[PDB]
Amino acid sequence: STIEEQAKTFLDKFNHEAEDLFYQSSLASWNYNTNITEENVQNMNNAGDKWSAFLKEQSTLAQMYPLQEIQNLTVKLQLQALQQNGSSVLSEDKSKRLNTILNTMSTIYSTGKVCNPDNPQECLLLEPGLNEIMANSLDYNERLWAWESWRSEVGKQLRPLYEEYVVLKNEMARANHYEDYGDYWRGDYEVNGVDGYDYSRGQLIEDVEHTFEEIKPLYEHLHAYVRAKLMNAYPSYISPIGCLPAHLLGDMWGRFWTNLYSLTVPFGQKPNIDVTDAMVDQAWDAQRIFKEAEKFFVSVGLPNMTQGFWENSMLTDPGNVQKAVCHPTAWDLGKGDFRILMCTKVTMDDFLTAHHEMGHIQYDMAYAAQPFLLRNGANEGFHEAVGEIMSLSAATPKHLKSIGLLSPDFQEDNETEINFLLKQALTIVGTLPFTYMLEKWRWMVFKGEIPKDQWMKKWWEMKREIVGVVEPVPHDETYCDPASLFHVSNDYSFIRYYTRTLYQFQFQEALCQAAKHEGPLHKCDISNSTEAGQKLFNMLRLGKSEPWTLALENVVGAKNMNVRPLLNYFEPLFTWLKDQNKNSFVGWSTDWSPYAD
Amino acid sequence: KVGGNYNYRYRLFRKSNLKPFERDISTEIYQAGNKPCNGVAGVNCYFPLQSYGFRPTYGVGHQPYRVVVLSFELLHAPATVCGPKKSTNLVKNKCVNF
């Protein structure tokens, strides 16, 4: 009759009804995503609204049990995940205003239009054309026009909305005892009451700042190399001791440097390994790819596919008229129903995306025995790390030469090694400073340390000091440059893309030692080893039942995220770069600007 | 049936564990808290039946599995139901053991 025993009684009924309603909602959403019609939209909206209403009613019902008298840890976790008010703690007018400005920001970002100065009836949206000009063009003036106009004709509409969204979200977050909206975001990595694995919401800042303090020696050399290579495609525009103009980086924002590969390739006469001709040579189809992926997965000690995965999944694009949004994803409809939706062609990118998606499917199959509220990764940075280590270890030459896609001998040299390592560095290391800087800016904005008359100044000061890029045109306090990013205007967190990159290589080095690898880390293959599979399964099957600082120790041996595995992975490229910059100047000065002349 | 088969109704709440070979078909409201609810749903009072949501697109382990449980009893009856024997044949004109 105590206050603890009634919690379990409530949780049982909640679990059952929630499983049922969630399955109905997910089935409706899938039937819409694979077959676009008009009545499917309403048939999906009905089930979605029913599920949301049930969730809201159970949430407002669960407030009767005080989280202080609970003794079990699983019950306490479930209650605390259910008791959270979230939004709707505000008034009604404020909630309507918040939803309106959120939808307005999303719409402004989605359908923003810019057009030419000399032919004003030639307007281009963002996705079909702006991030294509910024991706393939090699003209300085055209890239500058695109980068300036996107921020001058769309970013200027998002500032008076962001200035209100900040205050509204800060109020909503202070209504739940969080001191700001940034602490509400960092509250995901919190762990309390375990006696040995505690983790405050304020230690994430220090951990991030201490793990970024050791990537600077490598990012500096990569920056110097990319600068010395860019001083040849746009002569007399880059200075040998200055930063890089922000429009010569590869895309609209500079998040990924991966489009600079055609300019900064180390050895341009050795083609990187790309087995696409052999697949069409042996006539591989959309099903042999997934058979090979499943074979690789079962090789390490993980179960087969559930046999309900083969008939219900959509592995090929439906032909006649079945307009379908096929963005490769893995579904978890529940009750033992797993499906995959993707438009597979016969290439190598699909051959790796199959492994990436089946990684998510295996993770979902792992923890399917936990209660309903505990079916997720340990935190927001485990799912993608697990899904990425598979595609990391499945694209090696040693693995490709055993399936049959490569010639039997195929001696490997060090030039292609450096080519591959550098192509990997432009995507892995080229985004960590950007992510860290953006999330630091957002934390300082929400916390209240950057008054609303010093937003752009501080943004560009930090972009000059941390990332190492400079703007080509002065931006006063009417612009809002971060708001022109998808994750900033659509209200998504951004610290997961930083911790995922560390967890990925931590897991890879932890598994390389159970498989007893010998050479460098970027030649690892975990296949044909039942120790790596066992170590990984000791963590996959936990879900959110345990604190993440314990699920991490059960694999790597430490509690906090580390940065040594990443440097151990990039060691050879590091030495080569350190010997290619004997004459250049490693570093930058924050005074040179492309307009100060 | 596609769309849900709501006719199978396993019970999930009871005041005590069942005894061997008993049956309980009562449908009273389970009292969880300490305040009586007088036979109506609400807070801390639930309906003790939780019908299965059967569908064809489930996974093995969530699909229906019919069950039959044969149980034998021999208290004191001398001649009862028995299994079948392969009736032999009757021979003649030979010293036989019959």
Ligand SMILES: *[C@@H]1O[C@H](CO)[C@@H](O[C@@H]2O[C@H](CO)[C@@H](O)[C@H](O)[C@H]2NC(C)=O)[C@H](O)[C@H]1NC(C)=O
């Ligand atoms: C895609 O959805 C449409 C409509 O939502 C389906 O079109 C009809 O659906 C009804 C539903 O019972 C069927 O009775 C009709 O025979 C369907 N028309 C045709 C021409 O097939 C359509 O079948 C769906 N596609 C798939 C592959 O399920």
Ligand SMILES: *[C@@H]1O[C@H](CO)[C@@H](O[C@@H]2O[C@H](CO)[C@@H](O)[C@H](O)[C@H]2NC(C)=O)[C@H](O)[C@H]1NC(C)=O
């Ligand atoms: C309350 O806590 C106990 C132990 O602290 C949990 O007992 C576990 O129950 C699961 C399944 O019910 C078993 O697999 C474990 O072996 C049990 N552990 C121990 C140490 O006995 C119990 O599950 C918790 N209550 C709930 C609702 O989860």
Ligand SMILES: *[C@@H]1O[C@H](CO)[C@@H](O[C@@H]2O[C@H](CO)[C@@H](O)[C@H](O)[C@H]2NC(C)=O)[C@H](O)[C@H]1NC(C)=O
């Ligand atoms: C969640 O929101 C409710 C309001 O909707 C907060 O207020 C408490 O609600 C309970 C439930 O009826 C009342 O019994 C309390 O008197 C309310 N006031 C309190 C507790 O001060 C509730 O505090 C919120 N809880 C969380 C964890 O956000």
Ligand SMILES: *[C@@H]1O[C@H](CO)[C@@H](O[C@@H]2O[C@H](CO)[C@@H](O)[C@H](O)[C@H]2NC(C)=O)[C@H](O)[C@H]1NC(C)=O
């Ligand atoms: C790849 O390896 C070869 C040898 O295995 C390297 O060639 C030697 O490089 C050193 C250092 O510059 C020279 O002192 C030797 O004279 C080279 N030997 C020959 C036969 O050329 C080559 O430099 C390596 N390439 C990279 C990119 O590391």
Ligand SMILES: *[C@@H]1O[C@H](CO)[C@@H](O[C@@H]2O[C@H](CO)[C@@H](O)[C@H](O)[C@H]2NC(C)=O)[C@H](O)[C@H]1NC(C)=O
């Ligand atoms: C995993 O191990 C198995 C068996 O040890 C390998 O399968 C054999 O590989 C050799 C190498 O060419 C072939 O000659 C045999 O015909 C294979 N046997 C079968 C039954 O296929 C497999 O290649 C290994 N996989 C990896 C990635 O190392």
Ligand SMILES: *[C@@H]1O[C@H](CO)[C@@H](O)[C@H](O)[C@H]1NC(C)=O
């Ligand atoms: C997986 O399925 C294959 C049949 O395609 C079978 O030969 C193999 O034994 C199965 N392995 C497991 C672990 O179920």
